[PDB]
Amino acid sequence: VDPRLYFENRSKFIQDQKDKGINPYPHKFERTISIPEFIEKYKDLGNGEHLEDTILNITGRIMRVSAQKLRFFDLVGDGEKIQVLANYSFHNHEKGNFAECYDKIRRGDIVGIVGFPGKSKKGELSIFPKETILLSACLHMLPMKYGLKDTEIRYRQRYLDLLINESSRHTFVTRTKIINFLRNFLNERGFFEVETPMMNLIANARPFITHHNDLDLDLYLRIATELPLKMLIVGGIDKVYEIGKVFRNEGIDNTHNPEFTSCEFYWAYADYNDLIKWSEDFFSQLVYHLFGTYKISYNKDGPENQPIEIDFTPPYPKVSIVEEIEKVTNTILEQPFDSNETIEKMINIIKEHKIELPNPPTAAKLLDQLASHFIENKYNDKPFFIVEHPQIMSPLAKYHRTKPGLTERLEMFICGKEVLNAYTELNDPFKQKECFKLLDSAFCTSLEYGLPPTGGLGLGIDRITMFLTNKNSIKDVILFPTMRP
């Protein structure tokens, strides 16, 4: 019962049985059935009923072991479990002696089993092996039920987590049918999945640097998928999307990972109205798809504290950033914008409310600060859009038709943090401040080639999974989060 000594004992076990000719790691075991299939077929039987003349070969890992004439194990696989009832009478003795063969089995051992299904004495569904073979041996003591969490090796060694905690398994299953539902959701609308370079010549933001040796160029990992997708829009693909890894060099956080999965799509002849309805539809239908209801409960502060219900029933509240800033601070900010006096105006708003006064105090920064202290968590109760950002804050999104100095842009916040960001792209090459005379330039040139009016959108899939799987950290919804050794 000292895990190092246990490890040593089991290693020695392995070799002295290899010495007897028995191989503890056999090459192949033909599998007739899987534990869930097993359950589904045989779940309805009488209590104490055996069916002894259909012989099955089933496999799994032994997660519970209990002990002359009988042995009970708990065999698990595919996140589900059946009991293993070994009877002396049914055992095929010529394969090996009963005692010796079933004494070799320890918890965590992966075994093949030849036997017949039936339910137990009072009829818990079980398989009765005529013989039990060791497919792979576990050399370590598996941590017990609550042995992990806090742990945090759980991120380092994930397999242990997936074995012991069901919640993580369930979490990841959920993650991939979130992505599944997203991909299908898009595909059904005629969207087109593509792959875009992860190493680009030009990369404004905080990148990684990598180097190709023989091409002898230093390249940067992508901060987003946007530009080449828009170039694809220019190319005749008018509905296009990509689900892929994106990279940023900034610091790690609860909600931040250097490596995060994003879904960015571009949609021709659509503006942020169709994008908003797209968001409402997607999130509503997704939440209903998972939970059979639009209402979910999410624990923001710990598990130990009162959750908050989040209602994904559409439509979601839309808040003009500037307007409600102007209403709450009760000053008329602008007329637009960065503009000297208004700067000063904004700055004083920042000081009296004892907010950060971020430096350098340019206008965009001040607007971001103001907008987030005031607006960003205004509504927790459900996802809400922050709309019509100033176009000093958004030198991509096209100018708002009616409201000048603003953009057509929407940013969807769930539970105080950013999830979705979508805007109508600016297709006028003369109105893009970014294109300079003497890559990104390929996008500007493609822009000279007449990109149609198009709305774009991008997603937080890691964070979305966080909220839908009810987790407070991004590392819980990621299989192997990046960590320092």
Next chain:
Amino acid sequence: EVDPRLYFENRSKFIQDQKDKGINPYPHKFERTISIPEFIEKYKDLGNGEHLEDTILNITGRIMRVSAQKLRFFDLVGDGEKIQVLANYSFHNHEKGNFAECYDKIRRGDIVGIVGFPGKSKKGELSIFPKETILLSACLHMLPMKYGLKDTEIRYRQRYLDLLINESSRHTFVTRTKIINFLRNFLNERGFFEVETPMMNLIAGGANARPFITHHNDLDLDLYLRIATELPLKMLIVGGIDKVYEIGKVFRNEGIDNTHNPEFTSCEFYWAYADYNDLIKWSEDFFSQLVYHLFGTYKISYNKDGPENQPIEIDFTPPYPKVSIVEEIEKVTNTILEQPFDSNETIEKMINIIKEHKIELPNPPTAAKLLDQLASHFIENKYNDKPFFIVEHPQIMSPLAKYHRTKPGLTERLEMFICGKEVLNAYTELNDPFKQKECFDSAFCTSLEYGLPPTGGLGLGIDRITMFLTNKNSIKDVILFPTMRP
């Protein structure tokens, strides 16, 4: 022929002159009744010269051709198909603007919204008759012709041109997407579980390929881009996901050629309680069913040589030939290599073989890479008419694969080849920690200590397969934005 530069200038001037008149050359929203392929489908079979004059639609498109009175013709393309735009003076709504100038404004490459009614030309091909046509997004360049692209840098560098003009290219990439979709669904239907793995590992590259190196500054940690998805996936098999797979980008740093590029999409899966016979049936089934899915037949024509040159026909009808590598080498060279293997005598023997026969190039002389080289010359190009397996590689050549049951010094391993190129790689994983050579990465060797079931695993170059199914001699053709020096 006109000069491109001042054409560009001319319509830039056009654009802001149009802005000076209050007109917006880049409108915010055009709302669309119908998309061109839907248009096509609905109205194809209208009688010649038939006209639905009560039905008014708003349709968008890009102008790819223009004819010069009171009558105008265009080719409106979108979503891969084409309708003609018949602008009749008598039909055109004059209240919005003058016919002449409104339609003298439109020139090739422009993206226009069109409000008008469907019909068919008296000559009998489908047409949209605008009562009104508005400019959505203007194109400032002449655009090239079917001459313009292939063969060219800008076919790759400016991709949108390739997709617009060539009309072959986007069929290619559609195909790539249908390949990958078909693969994902193919795996999903078998109870496989898609996952996402780190693209950045502390693990370096591998003996075969140099690593891409990057650095995370705040953790002050040197990270290496993944050369394969294998290790975390196998760790997931330890974790209780018995059928797992990932389709994603994979990074190798070696040189660039037609069949190789540094950043390529691969698909790798791991299958518990499966041995490679399951894997070969899997390979044969995937490829057979796939080729039939796309082409309606099991045989496809690929040009091993250039387009001018005679294409060979490849037959994907299973089962495919299995060729034991060492034994085949022995049979063709008519020398008995081994018994095993890296024997100084045997290494010498192999060298003598390569130089004496082929004058094929010796290399830094590892026994493994020797075997690989002789294999490369002799066996690989044997079958170009059918996809074929090179099977049972010696374990010196394959550290990860499990030992062959009945044959010493060999592994249970397959490698599938199309036209002499390496498409698919699979083997039965070696789950014994003590048998394992590396354990004498650490996280994987430790994963084995909690036990890993008998598993088998496979990986797919997607880009190459896409080449062979889309008939391309270079991988740069099936990758949307290939990497090139500017």
